[PDB]
Amino acid sequence: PPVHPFVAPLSYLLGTWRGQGEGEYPTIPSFRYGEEIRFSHSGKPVIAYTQKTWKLESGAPLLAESGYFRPRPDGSIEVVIACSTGLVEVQKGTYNVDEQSIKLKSDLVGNASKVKEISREFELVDGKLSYVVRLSTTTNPLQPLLKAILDKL
Amino acid sequence: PPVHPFVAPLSYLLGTWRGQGEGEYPTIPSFRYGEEIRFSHSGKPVIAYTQKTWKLESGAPLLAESGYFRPRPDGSIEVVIACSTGLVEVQKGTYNVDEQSIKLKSDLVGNASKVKEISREFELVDGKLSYVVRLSTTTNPLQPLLKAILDKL
Ligand SMILES: [Ba+2]
Ligand SMILES: [Ba+2]
Ligand SMILES: [Ba+2]
Ligand SMILES: [Ba+2]
């Protein structure tokens, strides 16, 4: 199938991405994990997202996401992601093409234990994927929670 | 890696499942689509789930959904899903080991315009995985939309 015009200005994003990342929150200490993000499409104005985490040494698998990225010309964007942890997010926000980012905040965080707002950012910096999740809980403001870097497979 | 004990009762599901479906609804007459379904896992208390529909001759892509099941040892199962429509569900239910069945019913369908409810039902009927989808809208009660019957691959 061929790139739909909506999906085509995020065509760099496309393919397997793979490196490792680093979590830390006021509640907990630096811990490190490998990552694997895949962006795809089959003609439609929607980009599939899957992701998986895994322990470095083992490295037995940790967490795992699967989603739909749904871009539009006016530079705005919507994104729904399910997590094995048992959340679902519907994130609204924008993509600029010069910089080659996407910037989301949560709109609806669904079946959330203590989770409030969650903001994901995927930018291409220096030809690698820089992906960050900021978090808020019932006790702590939005802040940098994770930060992963990834390379083109 | 080993089938979490919490998950072991549902092992009939693990693997890829090909078939066809059909929609009828009061506003859309009969139709028919190709359709795959695969459940996997990864040594967690979770079965991963992906599903994609095509056009029978084309078979050009139609829709994908993905997510995650959490069975409990108590009967309850709680599912999450993101759909290429651009729409998430929370599903919560109660499965069944020798009726071999997983009945679900939306506890939250985010990012919907006009959907109000969705249930799903995943069940083995004489060897093939039958999938029944039902929906209510602003204007329609909780009735059938999608039926599909899939053969283990
Ligand atoms: Ba423009
Ligand atoms: Ba940049
Ligand atoms: Ba029991
Ligand atoms: Ba049965």
From Swiss-Prot, chains A, B:
Cofactor note: Binds 1 heme b group per subunit, that coordinates a highly solvent-exposed Fe(III) atom.
Pfam families xrefs: THAP4_heme-bd
One Gene Ontology cellular component annotation held by this UniProt entry: cytosol
Keyword Isomerase: yes
Localization per record: Cytoplasm
Gene3D superfamilies the record matches: 2.40.128.20
Cofactor requirement: heme b
Disulfide-linked positions: none
Annotated EC: 5.99.-.-
Family from the record: Belongs to the nitrobindin family.
Domain notes: Forms a 10-stranded antiparallel beta-barrel structure able to accommodate a hydrophobic ligand in its interior. In fact, this fold hosts the heme group, which is located in a wide surface cleft.
Name of the protein described by the UniProt record: Peroxynitrite isomerase Rv2717c
Organism in which the protein naturally occurs: Arabidopsis thaliana
